[PDB]
Amino acid sequence: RPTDIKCSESYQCFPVCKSRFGKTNGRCVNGFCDCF
């Protein structure tokens, strides 16, 4: 899902998603993290 976690770049999200939600990967969509 998309979130409201602000980011400039994807490598910011990926570990945050893996840490928080336990998702496989994340990507910065339109300046906000999307985890999947």
Curated annotation (Swiss-Prot):
Disulfide bonds join C7-C28, C13-C33, C17-C35. The keyword Ion transport does not apply. The record marks R20 as: Crucial for Kv11/ERG channel binding. GO terms for cellular component: extracellular region. Changing F14A: 8.2-fold decrease in affinity to Kv11/ERG potassium channels. Changing R27K: 60% loss of toxicity. No loss of activity. Changing V29A: 1.2-fold decrease in affinity to ERG-potassium channels. The record marks K18 as: Crucial for Kv11/ERG channel binding, plugs its side chain into the channel selectivity filter. Changing D4A: 3.4-fold decrease in affinity to Kv11/ERG potassium channels. Transmembrane segments: none annotated. Keywords: Disulfide bond, Ion channel impairing toxin, Neurotoxin, Potassium channel impairing toxin, Secreted, Signal, Toxin, Voltage-gated potassium channel impairing toxin. GO terms for molecular function: ion channel inhibitor activity; potassium channel regulator activity; toxin activity. Expressed by the venom gland. Changing F36A: 3.2-fold decrease in affinity to Kv11/ERG potassium channels. Changing R1A: 6.7-fold decrease in affinity to Kv11/ERG potassium channels. It is found in: Secreted. Changing Q12A: 2.3-fold decrease in affinity to Kv11/ERG potassium channels. Belongs to the short scorpion toxin superfamily. Potassium channel inhibitor family. Gamma-KTx 2 subfamily. Has the CSalpha/beta fold, which comprises one or two short alpha helices connected to anti-parallel beta-sheets stabilized by three or four disulfide bonds. The inhibition potency of the toxin for ERG1 decreases as temperature increases (IC(50)=7.6 nM and IC(50)=15.3 nM at room temperature and 37 degrees Celsius, respectively), likely due to changes in the structure of the channel binding site. Negative results: the toxin (at 100 nM) does not inhibit hEAG1/KCNH1, hBK/KCa1.1/KCNMA1, hSK1/KCa2.1/KCNN1, rSK2/KCa2.2/KCNN2, hIK/KCa3.1/KCNN4, KCNQ1+KCNE1, KCNQ2+KCNQ3 and KCNQ4 channels. The toxin (at 50 nM) does not inhibit Kv1.2/KCNA2, Kv1.4/KCNA4, Kv2.1/KCNB1, Kv4.3/KCND3, Kir1.1/KCNJ1. Blocks human and/or rat Kv11.1/KCNH2/ERG1, Kv11.2/KCNH6/ERG2 and Kv11.3/KCNH7/ERG3 by binding to channel outer vestibule (S5P domain) with a 1:1 stoichiometry. Inhibition data are the following: hERG1 (reversible, Kd=7.7 nM, IC(50)=3.3 nM, IC(50)=11.9 nM), rERG1 (reversible, Kd=19 nM), hERG2 (reversible, Kd=77 nM), rERG2 (irreversible, Kd=4.2 nM), hERG3 (reversible, Kd=11.5 nM) and rERG3 (reversible, Kd=747 nM) potassium channels. Also has a minimal effect on rat ELK1/KCNH4 potassium channels (9% inhibition at 100 nM). This is Potassium channel toxin gamma-KTx 2.1. The chain holds residues 22 to 57 of 57 of the full protein.
